[PDB]
């Protein structure tokens, strides 16, 4: 569902724990590289909590596996993203997404 490839290593031992907030920077792109969003463009990190279905299932399973300081490329198939419907005007139907995400800190 999600393929995770490391770009920059994290510590290998601080992983997100239940009810922590993850603070990340990310850049989301469709499969061919067309960028649709980036927190880094706003220079403002994105915060969310894992395990509560706040985010698509690729991030829930992807980011849970990351350790603080790691930066990784998550390649997420449509079934772990926005499915047959997509998000009309931004994410097409059946879209594989590629996010570049960096786990900055847990708070």
């Amino acid at each position: 569902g999600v393929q995770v490839e490391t770009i920059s290593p994290g510590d290998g031992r601080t992983f997100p724990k239940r009810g922590q907030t993850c603070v990340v920077h990310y850049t989301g792109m469709l499969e061919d590289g067309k960028k649709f969003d980036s927190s880094r463009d706003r220079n403002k990190p994105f915060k969310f909590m894992l395990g509560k279905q706040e985010v698509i299932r690729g991030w829930e399973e992807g980011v849970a596996q990351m350790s603080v300081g790691q930066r990784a490329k998550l390649t997420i198939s449509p079934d772990y993203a926005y499915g047959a419907t997509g998000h009309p005007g931004i994410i097409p139907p059946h879209a594989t997404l590629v996010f570049d995400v960096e786990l900055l800190k847990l708070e």
């Binding site: 706003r42 009309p88 005007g89 931004i90």
Partner: peptide, 11 residues
């Protein structure tokens, strides 16, 4: 009619 304007509202 551009959904990017509504995302900006959700930020």
């Amino acid at each position: 009619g551009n959904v990017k304007d509504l995302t900006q509202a959700w930020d």
